[PDB]
Symmetry: D2
Subunit: 31 residues, 4 copies
């Protein structure tokens, strides 16, 4: 299930995007 979050500010968006990509990379390997 996918959800969408609206974020205000380019810098804030960049931060959350990096954190989300980091979590997805962790899962793809698992650990």
């Amino acid at each position: 299930e996918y959800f969408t979050l609206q974020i205000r500010g380019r810098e804030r968006f960049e931060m959350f995007r990096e954190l989300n990509e980091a979590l997805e990379l962790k899962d793809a390997q698992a650990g």
Copy 2:
């Protein structure tokens, strides 16, 4: 400028939503 981030998983979405709301509350007061 608003951006939208697609997140996978209800629990992950809840976490990012709380973090985003926390940052917005901090800004509304400023500090």
Copy 3:
């Protein structure tokens, strides 16, 4: 109960510090 997390990199530390302060401000008011 307090815990301590060791973080590598000033920029990363700044980011987590802002996020942690944001969550604490949210709790102090509650919502």
Copy 4:
């Protein structure tokens, strides 16, 4: 340079620990 952040609450600590480990895994590979 390593920094230390004091966090209140086991659940909050768990969340930041997962996020920090995710960022470190991303860097170890780079991307």
